[PDB]
Write a protein that binds this ligand. Structure first.
Ligand code: HEM
Ligand SMILES: CCCCCCCCCC(=O)N[C@H]1CCOC1=O
Length: 455
């Protein structure tokens, strides 16, 4: 049976659009998914998006012979400063496949052995920050984790120190990057993009694009002149050759990759870590298990690569945090041809889809009745997870190139956090989820009591 798909509440000639007039649009879409179910159509004057929430349907949409990565309105506006970087390029664009093939060995598990020492440098900065806090003081979790992860990609990306822990006041790159991401994410909700009440936003966006371009072009130019061969993504991209085309990346596409990376570091792995610590202090049985592992495995003052690989339960904690609050909550796809989804939903070539990863990860048919429970033990058998059930890093050849990088950093940092401190939810924090490009807990504070283990 061919069926009509449900649609949420309309607003006259604006259709669904005003439902985007919130700073918590994923959360609203999750609430809409709870009401309407495995698939609903979302219509604006400009476009139509079909939202997928079931494993059944999402496993079809993850067929690369039938569907390809789409740029949502948001990614299309991110492209104004991330250009044809790996994140904002179409799959069939020459520059996607070039950068993909050149950078893939830079992001392998083997390569993490190289980034390790630099990840540890920033990890120790956090631990030492927290060791030096006075007894009557708390930790601003997403704030400090976003400091750690930004600095990690600065050092590994292009051997630059943001020094995030050494200032309250942000780096001028980061003011512009955050304001551009805000404007990119806010544009699609405007009924009339071209009203003079958005001319100041338009001016500020152009300025922020220029600021980001100027500063990364200088970095690229300084590196080309020094001939300096640091083991960072920038050297790799400067010496890189695509085996297919035989071409290197042009300086402009390298600018887009650095901008892309700096966005990923600031938005994503910070959210994973913040949500991990949240679920630990709210599940002290799980916190105690994570902490015993950290204590038993991290027997040296500085964690080795090998020792991070051995933090299995910390790894399980991270996966279960990515299940309930995938900090990157969505990916879009398009129909490569006319076709039928789940034998029920006729699609035309070019029709846009959106996977709500938070809903896929709540599918009771996949995860059973205890779906809202935080149980890392769900991942204890890694091979029991069905195909296309857990997609915190997207799908196929357009999956996250930084997945090995993010889980290494996350495991390293959470390991060291659990070794060096006990954590109290002193304020009985009520989950409040701030949405940028990514989901983070807003206002999440804890107290860390030092376990007095020397570094
Ligand atoms: C916990 C951390 C992270 C999560 C949850 C995450 C999630 C994702 C997701 C869902 C996608 C696919 C987007 C789509 O289909 O539209 C993606 C793509 C990407 N991510 Fe991440 N990400 C993380 C960390 C990182 C980091 C640290 C980097 C780089 C420093 C990074 C770089 C990228 C890139 C370059 C792509 C585009 C890959 C391509 O299509 O070739 N990510 N990420
Ligand atoms: C990978 C992290 C970013 C997640 C994707 C951003 C989009 C999530 C919410 C959503 O569906 N918004 C629609 C509104 C119109 O066009 C969009 O883009």
């Amino acid at each position: 049976t061919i069926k009509e798909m449900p649609q949420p509440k309309t607003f006259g000639e604006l259709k669904n659009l005003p439902l985007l007039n919130t700073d918590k649009v994923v959360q609203a879409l999750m609430k809409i998914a709870d009401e309407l179910g495995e698939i609903f159509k979302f219509e604006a004057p400009g476009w139509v998006l079909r939202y997928l929430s079931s494993q059944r349907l999402i496993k079809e949409a993850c067929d690369e012979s039938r569907f390809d990565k789409n740029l949502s309105q948001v990614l299309k506006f991110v492209r104004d400063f991330a250009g044809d970087g790996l994140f904002t390029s179409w799959t069939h664009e020459k520059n996607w496949k070039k950068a993909h093939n050149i950078l893939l060995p830079s992001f392998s598990q083997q390569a993490m052995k190289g980034y390790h020492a630099m990840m540890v440098d920033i990890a120790v900065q956090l631990v030492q920050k927290w060791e030096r806090l006075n007894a009557d003081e708390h930790i601003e979790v997403p704030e400090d984790m976003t400091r750690l992860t930004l600095d990690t990609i600065g050092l590994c990306g292009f051997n630059y120190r943001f020094n995030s822990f050494y200032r309250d006041q942000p780096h001028p790159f980061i003011t512009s990057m955050v304001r551009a991401l805000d404007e990119a994410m806010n544009k699609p909700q405007r009924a009339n993009p071209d009203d003079p009440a958005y001319d100041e936003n338009k001016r500020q966006f152009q300025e922020d694009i220029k600021v980001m371009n100027d500063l990364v072009d200088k970095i690229i130019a300084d590196r080309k002149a020094s001939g300096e061969q640091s083991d960072d993504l920038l050297t790799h991209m400067l010496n890189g050759k695509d085996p297919e085309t035989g071409e290197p990346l042009d300086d402009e596409n390298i600018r887009y990759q650095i901008i892309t990376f700096l966005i990923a570091g600031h938005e994503t792995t910070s959210g994973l870590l913040s949500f991990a610590l949240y679920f630990l202090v709210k599940n002290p049985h799980v916190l105690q298990k994570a902490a015993e592992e950290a204590a038993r495995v991290l027997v040296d003052p500085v964690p080795s690569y090998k020792q991070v690989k051995q933090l299995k339960y910390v790894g399980m904690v991270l996966n279960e945090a990515l299940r309930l609050w995938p900090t990157a909550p969505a990916f879009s796809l398009y129909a490569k041809e006319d076709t039928v989804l789940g034998g029920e939903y006729p699609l035309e070539k070019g029709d846009e889809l959106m996977v709500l990863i938070p809903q896929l990860h709540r599918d009771k048919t996949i995860w059973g009745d205890d779906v809202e429970e935080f149980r890392p033990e769900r991942f204890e058998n890694p091979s029991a997870i069905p195909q296309h059930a857990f997609k915190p890093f997207g799908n196929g050849q357009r999956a996250c190139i930084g997945q090995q990088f993010a889980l290494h950093e996350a495991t390293l940092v959470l390991g060291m956090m659990l070794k060096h401190f006990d954590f109290e939810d002193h304020t009985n924090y009520e989950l409040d989820i701030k949405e940028t490009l990514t989901l983070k807990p807003e206002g999440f504070v804890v107290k860390a009591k030092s376990k007095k283990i020397p570094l």
